Design a binder for this molecule. Structure first.
Ligand SMILES: OC[C@H]1O[C@@](CO)(O[C@H]2O[C@H](CO)[C@@H](O)[C@H](O)[C@H]2O)[C@@H](O)[C@@H]1O
Lengths: 185, 185
């Protein structure tokens, strides 16, 4: 028969995006080791992480189709994680200011008879930022929650000059590619 | 940019099946010491073997799209390999005689930004075979280099009553599904 759909992520943004497909699903997550391999490229690491998150849940629901995903913000081969302290979030934002960075989101779809994993990369260009903007933004507490210390939605939007790629992928889920992949499941 | 296509397989049938896509590609020979792990189902093992073959070549040629495949012949959960002795061939054929078995073929497609693995299962039903038929067929030496001790082409074609699935997958490569998957690469 057909298989039930599962989203192995508690990300609010991924939920609103997958809801666009109008395909019923449940959200089920099982924590996994997320320490990245020093010898993997960012492209290899982000796909590996999406793959692990999906597989942990697929192991618990072998008759389902499980979607795992992961997003990284990388600057000059170096990727920025979520800031621990405000001065770190501030340090990240100062680094992103006035230049471009890459946002890479991987998606892994797992089922017993078919698996597929891919990444989608988007170039994000920032206007030059000032300390006031940086700290004002930091106060909102929005940065303290995402990789690279910013979100393209809400107030972070004012920082973005332009993107070359997929806005939805920057939010956390390349929805058109995900929908296209699911047709073959 | 596009990516060159590579078939990680020495199988003549797979080469002739991939030729139907009329896509340019090369074949790369690889020594891969891969074995089944007893804690996997035939479905998990065949997909794992196909992925290892593709990955062994993809690791060496990261810019390409690599295709790996593997086929297993299974009877009631137990899968048959090639008979290293004619008396075994006759043994396998007798098991296969007058009943149905499963031919499971997995395909794995690997690229730096996208990977996909799946299996295709086909039910193959045999006519009740006679000792004469069986032995006479073995004397042809055709079933001695084939998993399950038979081939759906050549004289073995005379043993098959019908299939429910994909004839090309039984030969070693589900071509239509492979072509369809490649469209997303
Ligand atoms: O079957 C040849 C195939 O094996 C590889 C390893 O996968 O290389 C092996 O065989 C070569 C040719 O005989 C040797 O030169 C080499 O040292 C050995 O590893 C592939 O490179 C080759 O295509």
């Amino acid at each position: 028969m057909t298989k039930p759909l599962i989203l192995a992520s508690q990300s609010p943004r991924r939920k609103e995006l997958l809801d666009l497909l109008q395909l019923p699903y449940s959200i089920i997550v099982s924590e996994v080791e997320e320490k990245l391999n020093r010898n993997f490229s960012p492209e290899e690491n982000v796909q590996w992480l999406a793959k692990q998150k999906a597989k942990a849940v697929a192991d618990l629901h072998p008759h389902a189709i499980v979607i795992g995903a992961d997003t990284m913000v990388c600057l000059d081969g170096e990727c920025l994680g979520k800031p621990q302290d405000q001065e770190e979030a501030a340090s990240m934002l100062r680094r992103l200011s006035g230049r471009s960075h890459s946002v890479i989101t991987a998606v892994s779809i797992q089922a017993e008879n078919h698996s597929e994993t891919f990444y989608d990369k988007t170039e994000v260009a920032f206007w030059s930022l000032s300390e006031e903007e940086i700290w004002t933004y930091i106060e909102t507490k929005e940065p303290m929650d995402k990789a690279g210390a910013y979100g393209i939605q809400g107030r972070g939007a004012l920082f973005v000059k332009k993107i070359d790629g997929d806005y939805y992928s920057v939010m956390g889920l390349p929805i058109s590619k995900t929908m296209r992949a699911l047709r073959h499941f």
